[PDB]
Amino acid sequence: LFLQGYEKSWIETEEHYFEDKLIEDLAKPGAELPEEDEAMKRVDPLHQLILLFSRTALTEKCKLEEDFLYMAYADIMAKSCHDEEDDDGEEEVKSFEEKEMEKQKLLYQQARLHDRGAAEMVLQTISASKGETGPMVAATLKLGIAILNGGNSTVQQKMLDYLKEKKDVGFFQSLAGLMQSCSVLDLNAFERQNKAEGLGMVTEEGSGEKVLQDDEFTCDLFRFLQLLCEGHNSDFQNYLRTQTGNNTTVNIIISTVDYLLRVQESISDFYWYYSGKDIIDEQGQRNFSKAIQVAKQVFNTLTEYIQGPCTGNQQSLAHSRLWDAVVGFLHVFAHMQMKLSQDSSQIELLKELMDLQKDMVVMLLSMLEGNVVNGTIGKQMVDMLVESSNNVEMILKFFDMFLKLKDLTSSDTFKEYDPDGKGVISKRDFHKA
Amino acid sequence: EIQFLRTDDEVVLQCTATIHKEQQKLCLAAEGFGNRLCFL
Amino acid sequence: WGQPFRLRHVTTGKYLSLMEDKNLLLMDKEKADVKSTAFAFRSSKEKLDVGVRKEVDGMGTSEIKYGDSICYIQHVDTGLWLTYQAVDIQRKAIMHHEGHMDDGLNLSRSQHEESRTARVIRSTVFLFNRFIRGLD
C-alpha cells in the first residue's frame, strides 16, 4: 500500500503528457493512400471512436452507465489540448511572437478535436445524463471546456447549429437538473466534521472533508457555460434564454441566479460561526477560498450573459432574486474584510475576497450597458441600494483612512521623517505623525 | 382588407343540402384507420 | 379570454356535462346541449367580466401561453366555478358556489413532439376499442 501511494504520484506527473501528446498524433495519421473509388477515404480511427461514443450516448437507456472507456479517452483528449502551462512562472516571454504561436497551436489542436464531432459527443452526453451529476458528466464537461477554451467561434457555431437542427430539449433539461443538484457548504455537516474524536479528527479515517461534495464539477460546469458565450455571442446569449424552436422552453439565466442565491445563503451562514470567534481555522479558510472561487465563477458567468448588450437577458436578471443576492453579498462583503483587517497572517484570503469584490462591481457595472435615462433597471438598482445603505455607508465612510481597505495616502508619513533609510519608523512615530 | 387562400393552410369542405324541406349543413369527414370511405 | 366550448374525453368518446344535481357526469355524444356543456376560461377568480366581444376573423392575439400563464375555467350559463372537494388524493370535484382559492389550473399542452401522442391516443384507442367492442 505504501508503494501504491508512492507510485500513484511519483510517475503520473511525467507520464501523462508523454502518453497523451503521442497517442493523438498516432491516432491521427491521415496519410495512407486508399487507391479505391471511395469518397470519404478512411479519415482516422479517432472519428470511429467519436462515432462509437455518440452512438452509445444516442442509444436510449433511461440510465447512463459507467463506461470506463469514455472517462479514460475523454481524459486523454482533454489533456491533448492542454499544451499550455497557463502560468507566468519565470519572467515574461516575448510579446507578439510567442503568444500568437501558442494560440495557433491551440487552435490546431482544437481543430483536430472538433473536426470529428467532439462538440456533438459532448452535447449528446450532457443530454443523455438525465440531470444526474457524477464522473459520467465531469469528464464530459472537462472535455467541453477543453475544446471551447479560447472562445472558439467555429465550435460555438457547430454546437448552436446542432442544437437548432436537432431541436433538443433533453440537453437544457439536464443542464437545469445539474444546476439544481449542485452542492453547498453544509455548515451542519461542518460542525460534525470539526467535532470528531474529541477535537479535530484524531482517528484520521481518510481525507474526505465532505464539506463541498462537488467543487471542481461546479467550477467546470460554469466555466463551460461561460465559454459557451465568451466573445459576446448574441446567438447563444439569446438561445440560453428563449429556445424559440423548441416547445418546452427552459430558462438558464434564472436558474443561474437561483444557484447564486443558494451559494450566497451558504456564504452568509458561514460568517456568524466565525464572527464571534477571534481566529479563523485552517479548514475554515480553505472552505472560504473554495466558496469564493465558486462565487467568482458564477459572477463571471453572469457577466458573460450580459456583457454584450442583451436587453432580454438584462430584463430577465432585473426580474429575479439577484437583488436579494447582491444585498446579502454586500452585507457579507461589508462585515468580512474589516474583521480580516487586523490579522497579518490572513492576507491571502483578504486579497482573494477583494478579487470577488472587483468581480461583483464589474457585474453590477455590466448590468448598466444600454442604460436608458429613466430605466426600471436603474430604479431597481437604487431600490437595492436603499436597504443596503447601512453596509454601503460603513464601507464608503471607512474607505478612505490612508489604508485599511483602501488608500494610497499612507505614503505621507514615511517621507516626512526619514533621514536616508528605506523607512523603519517606530509605531510611536507613525502614530504621532 | 380582403383575404385570399394560400397553401399550407387548414380548410374544411362544407356543403349545403335540404331534406324534409329543412336545410342541412354538412362537413366532409374522413377516418384514417377504421375505413377508407368518406362520410358526412 | 372567455369563450364557450365543450370538452371531449378522447379515450372514451363522451362529453363532460354538468348534471342537474350539482355534479359533473361524463355523458354520451348523441344527446347533448350547450347549457350542460358550455365552459369558458376566466382571467381571475372574480365576476369582473360577464359578456363582451363576439366573433373575430382571425387569431391575431396570441393570448394564452402554455405553462407560464395561469387560467381559471368556469361554466358560463350556471355562473359557477370548478372547485376541488376533499372527500372523506382522490379529490372528487363538486360544484361548490364560492370555492376555495387553492384551485389554480396551470396549462401544459400535448407538444409537437407529443402531437404523435395525441394522434395515437385519439385514432388508435378510440376507433380500435369501439370497433372491437362492437365485434365482441
Side-chain angles (χ1 to χ4, degrees), chain B residues 3 33-34, chain C residues 57 123 127:
Chain B
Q3 287 161 5
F33 275 83
Chain C
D57 57 337
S123 58
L127 321 173

Side-chain angles (χ1 to χ4, degrees), chain C residues 26-51 53-132 134:
Chain C
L26 173 81
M27 182 212 160
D28 304 343
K29 182 256 186 181
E30 296 92 339
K31 290 94 157 172
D33 50 349
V34 182
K35 177 70 73 184
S36 61
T37 58
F39 294 78
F41 274 39
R42 304 263 190 276
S43 287
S44 175
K45 190 62 165 26
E46 48 209 58
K47 321 259 190 320
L48 86 171
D49 68 273
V50 197
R53 200 204 267 91
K54 215 184 71 61
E55 260 67 26
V56 178
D57 57 337
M59 303 145 298
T61 60
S62 89
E63 256 163 283
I64 306 136
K65 199 184 183 265
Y66 285 112
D68 283 38
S69 147
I70 328 287
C71 303
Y72 229 85
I73 168 72
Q74 164 166 53
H75 197 288
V76 170
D77 303 330
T78 317
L80 205 146
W81 310 87
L82 317 85
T83 73
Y84 81 108
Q85 181 179 88
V87 299
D88 61 352
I89 48 164
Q90 284 160 77
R91 315 188 321 251
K92 203 165 135 60
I94 312 291
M95 282 295 78
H96 277 291
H97 282 81
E98 200 267 314
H100 330 75
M101 172 295 308
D102 306 86
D103 202 81
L105 266 305
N106 207 357
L107 274 190
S108 177
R109 66 157 182 145
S110 176
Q111 277 75 41
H112 284 313
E113 202 168 10
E114 278 84 358
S115 69
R116 307 275 84 78
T117 301
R119 197 262 310 274
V120 61
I121 57 157
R122 147 72 202 188
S123 58
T124 64
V125 299
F126 192 49
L127 321 173
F128 175 71
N129 95 317
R130 261 289 318 116
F131 283 60
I132 283 295

Side-chain angles (χ1 to χ4, degrees), chain B residues 3-4 6 12 16-18 23-24 27-29 34 37:
Chain B
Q3 287 161 5
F4 312 102
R6 298 202 274 281
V12 159
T16 54
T18 172
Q23 295 293 332
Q24 292 278 90
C27 294
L28 263 172
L37 269 302

